[PDB]
Structure formats: C-alpha cells, structure tokens
Design a protein around this ligand. Structure first.
Ligand SMILES: [Zn+2]
Lengths: 49, 46, 74
C-alpha cells in the first residue's frame, strides 16, 4: 500500500527473505520482475520534449 | 579479539552478510572482506 | 531438479560438507555399483544425490555404515 519507489520494493524483498526464507523470495523476485516488465510496457511511459 | 591462533572463531566474527545464519567454519572471510572494501573506490570521488 | 539446495542444506547444515556428501553419492551412483534410492525423473546424478539428501535419506553417518556393511559382506 505504497508507491514502491525502488526502495519499498527492496524492503519488500528483504522482509520476504527474512520472514519466509529463500525459495519464496526467489519465486517472489521472479514474479515481481515479470509483472513489473509487463505493466511498465502496458503503461507506455515515454519521454518527450 | 578472536584470541584464537591461525584463524578466527566462528562466534567472534558475526553472522555472515550473504546468509541469514551464523557463519560456518572454513569460509575465507579475509578475501570477502578485502573484496567488499575494494569494490567501491572506483566510484569514490577522490 | 532442485533450483535451490536450501532444503538439502538444512538437513546437514554446513553448505560445505553437503557438497562433499553429494559428490560421494554421485560418484557412487555414476561409476557403478549403486542405484538411486529416490525415483529418478530423467535428471542427472547430482540432483538425485541432492534430493536424496533433502529427503533425509542420505547422510554421512549412514553412508559410512553402508560402506562398512558392504565391506563386511565381502
Ligand atoms: Zn575468536
């Protein structure tokens, strides 16, 4: 429930590792990267003049 | 203050930073420490 | 296959002796004179040994006692 600005996501992974373990955090990292790539592409974020 | 000879006690050196648990015997902590100190430095402003 | 060896590591926790135990078990299963104790799913001997360790069915003590029993039989 935040903005997840390159630091909240890192803390998300750190807490997942500390509380759950290694296999859940690896699966979580893979899923995070998949969904981030997909929704960044869907967003169509572009830099203009 | 490890007080041991030719090495370092597994307790006197805290838990390793790569893994959650305490550091196991046999890890080459000196090389890890040197690499960790020298990995920055190519970006220090001098 | 085993993407992570954490389950096998916690069975015999050193992250260093596990490599030796798995190497010995894989050597036994590869050079001949041994058969896997866990169902084999087309994967190589390394992960078979690792899965045997993770299941708690292969360890250093029981490897030594199995070698001793084999020597006693001969
Ligand atoms: Zn010490």
């Amino acid at each position: 429930n935040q903005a997840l600005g390159k630091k909240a996501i890192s803390k998300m992974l750190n807490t997942c590792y500390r509380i759950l373990g290694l296999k859940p955090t690896v699966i979580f990292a893979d899923q995070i990267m998949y969904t981030g790539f997909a929704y960044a592409a869907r967003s169509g974020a572009s830099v203009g003049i | 203050s490890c007080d041991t000879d030719f090495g370092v006690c597994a307790h006197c050196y805290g838990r390793d930073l790569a893994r959650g648990h305490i550091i196991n015997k046999g890890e080459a902590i000196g090389v890890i420490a040197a690499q960790s100190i020298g990995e920055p430095g190519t970006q220090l402003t001098m | 296959a085993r993407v992570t060896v954490q389950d096998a590591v916690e069975k015999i926790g050193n992250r260093f002796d596990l490599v030796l135990v798995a190497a010995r078990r894989a050597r036994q299963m590869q050079v001949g004179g041994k058969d896997p104790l866990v169902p084999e799913e087309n994967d190589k001997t390394t992960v078979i040994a690792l899965r045997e360790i993770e299941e708690g069915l292969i360890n250093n003590q029981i490897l030594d006692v199995r070698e001793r029993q084999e020597q006693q039989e001969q």
